[PDB]
Amino acid sequence: AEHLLKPLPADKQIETGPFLEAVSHLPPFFDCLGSPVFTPIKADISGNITKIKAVYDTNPAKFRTLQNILEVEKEMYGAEWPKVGATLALMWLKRGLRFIQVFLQSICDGERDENHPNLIRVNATKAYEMALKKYHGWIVQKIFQAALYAAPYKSDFLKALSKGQNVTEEECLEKIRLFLVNYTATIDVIYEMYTQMNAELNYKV
Ligand SMILES: CCCCCCO[C@H]1O[C@H](CO)[C@@H](O)[C@H](O)[C@H]1O
Ligand SMILES: CCCCCCCCCC
Ligand SMILES: *CCCCCC
């Protein structure tokens, strides 16, 4: 399974190449939601992955780790850093990754609206509220909240995730949990790197 992330090494330095390779399998899974109304969250994650790749691909040795990108871009472009280039793209990407995490985890934990137990709208909304909303002005909130309102049925979403293979609903859930392990750990380290490096900005778009 190629969306599975590597374990963290002991020094916690995330290698850019394998990271980019693994998360770039995430955007296509937005199609499992069904609707093309979710293209805003999908396209955003995607675009940020591409911008980080654009920098990385110019010089994989120098941009070997995620930390390298931040330190090097600070050297190249001190006045505007961290509001620059791949540093900024990763700043936004982590929030989108956290959104996905907290969404999936909430599903696995079995949180639900008792009034609408086969939807995943509460899961999406809680994910958006904790990960992204505080960084979005009203117009972008309008866009993201319209789309969450097309959240599919839980059973459909899970059936869709496990297409091509023969796997029960709680086998599919077991697979989500497994993915969440190194995925969650990596996200935590990215957030922590942003705080440690004074790279975190809180403006709204
Ligand atoms: C898919 C449309 C939703 C817009 C969300 C916003 O975030 C963007 O904001 C910054 C500009 O400050 C870009 O650098 C990011 O790449 C992007 O996610
Ligand atoms: C929000 C859509 C992203 C889903 C990612 C799930 C991948 C891991 C489970 C197979
Ligand atoms: C089918 C088109 C939906 C477009 C939303 C950006």
Residue numbers in the entry: 5 to 209
Show passages lifted from the paper.
Mammalian glycolipid transfer proteins (GLTPs) are potential regulators of cell processes mediated by GSLs and display a unique architecture among lipid binding/transfer proteins. The 23–24-kDa GLTPs display absolute specificity for glycolipids, are highly conserved among mammals, and include plant and fungal orthologs that have been implicated in programmed cell death responses. The liganding site consists of a sugar headgroup recognition center that anchors the ceramide-linked sugar to the protein surface and a hydrophobic tunnel that accommodates the hydrocarbon chains of ceramide. Here we report crystal structures of human GLTP bound to GSLs of diverse acyl chain length, unsaturation, and sugar composition.
To search for additional conformational states related to the GLTP working cycle, we cocrystallized GLTP with a model compound, n-hexyl-β-d-glucoside, in which the sugar headgroup was β-linked to a single short (six-carbon) hydrocarbon chain, rather than a two-lipid chain ceramide moiety. GLTP binds the entire ligand at the protein surface, with the hydrophobic tunnel remaining closed and containing extraneous hydrocarbon for apo-GLTP. The same network of multiple specific interactions are observed between the n-hexyl-β-d-glucoside headgroup and the GLTP recognition center, with the only differences being the following: (1) the absence of hydrogen bonding between K55 and the glucosyl OH4 group because of its equatorial positioning and (2) the loss of hydrogen bonds involving ligands carrying the ceramide amide group and residues H140 and D48, which are now water bridged to each other. In apo-GLTP and the n-hexyl-β-d-glucoside–GLTP complex, the tunnel has collapsed, although the bottom (represented by cylinder 2) remains occupied by an extraneous hydrocarbon. A disruption of the H7/H29 stacking is observed in all apo-GLTP structures in which the H7 residue is resolved, including in our D48V apo-GLTP, as well as in our n-hexosyl glucoside–GLTP complex. In contrast, on n-hexyl-β-d-glucoside acquisition, there is only limited outwards movement of the α helix 2 N-terminal segment and adjacent loop L12, but no movement of the α helix 2 along its axis nor outward movement of α helix 6, keeping phenylalanine F148 in a swung-in position and allowing for only partial opening of the hydrophobic channel, in a fashion similar to that observed recently in GM3-His6-tagged bovine GLTP complex. Comparison of the apo-GLTP and the n-hexyl-β-d-glucoside–GLTP complex provides clear evidence that the recognition and anchoring of the sugar head triggers conformational rearrangements of the gate region, L12 loop.
